[PDB]
């Protein structure tokens with residue numbers, strides 16, 4: 019029913035500007051106060067901006083300092099946030115929020131749109147197969163991996179055998195290494211099934227429009 | 240400015256326990272709200288106006304408090320309650336920093352596995368040695384790397400998964416990243432897990448001059 023759908027997040031260089039949009043459905047958008055709340059990478063939640071139902075009443079959070087402009091087009095059921103002179107501290111997930119009453123709980127939240135402020139440029143990942151090799155295992159189970167290295171920005175999507183190996187998968191949160199992201203994913207299959215049954219990790223990096231499959235082959239020792 | 244603090248930052252409890260978490264204000268305010276967030280999704284209104292429950296919230300939850308102190312309470316906690324809970328109130332810029340409620344379960348030792356750098360990575364001049372410590376509990380685990388009999392500390396990055404949604408275990412990767420030239424100057428690589436499930440470490444190792 020009620021839907022809030024944000025858009026317009028992306029990579030922006032420091033000093034730059036960005037407009038975020040929040041398309042509303044399923045309710046009389048013009049009767050409700052709306053807000054933007056952001057969640058920083060440290061998961062801190064900050065009340066960025068508030069706008070009354072008629073667009074005649076507005077508040078900004080303490081560090082916005084005039085660099086943010088909240089607006090709304092009730093005819094097109096859309097909330098906006100203009101952002102300008104962006105700083106690294108403005109990197110966050112930006113959520114559009116609806117207000118319930120005049121104690122200002124936020125009863126509906128959109129999916130969020132991500133805003134990344136840095137000089138880093140979009141970089142496809144390198145993907146490396148992780149076969150045991152010299153570290154061979156001998157149990158009823160074998161664990162294999164893919165190393166996804168050197169991409170920006172987040173996120174990458176990892177699947178195994180196109181999602182057909184779903185159980186026994188651990189894809190670890192990425193970490194910044196040389197100011198680029200790296201993560202690994204592990205998969206555990208019965209040892210009787212590898213290499214007799216192929217195992218492939220599927221890595222997608224939409225921001226670079228890259229797809230790569232790495233077959234996990236036993237090493238040529 | 241009026242600011243919120245939350246305690247504890249992290250707690251774990253078995254299902255069936257009473258859970259309480261506290262939201263403190265630097266000066267008196269009223270009509271506190273509480274938002275629930277689980278990984279990968281948006282905050283959800285959970286409690287509002289100090290004590291009203293949002294739609295879909297089980298009666299096991301309750302909100303209470305006044306003045307400078309507020310609390311969220313859960314009777315007979317259930318696994319689905321695991322989430323981060325943030326307090327906020329209509330005059331506050333920064334939400335409380337949240338309480339992360341995690342699920343206690345039986346101790347479990349990690350399954351440990353080590354991977355030499357791939358030949359494809361070596362071709363590019365990098366060398367990552369990857370060690371997986373999978374399906375263990377509690378989250379606190381110590382990973383030690385040893386290279387040719389001497390402990391190594393530089394160049395190690397560790398990454399924990401969120402508590403697993405099915406079995407409440409943790410998993411973590413420990414990755415040792417080296418230049419190809421530094422990797423080629425040593426031979427024995429060891430990844431050791433020390434956890435409270437045993438006094439003896441779990442050890443996985445390889446020699447580079449094999450394979």
Ligand SMILES: C[C@]12C[C@H](O)[C@H]3[C@@H](CCC4=CC(=O)CC[C@@]43C)[C@@H]1CC[C@@H]2C(=O)CO
Nearest residue numbers: 065067068077078079080122329330331332
């Ligand atoms: C909380 C803020 C101050 C104040 O409390 C605001 C709130 C937005 C909603 C709102 C509307 C009103 O008509 C009464 C004040 C109030 C409920 C504001 C959002 C940003 C601002 C701050 O960040 C102040 O630190």
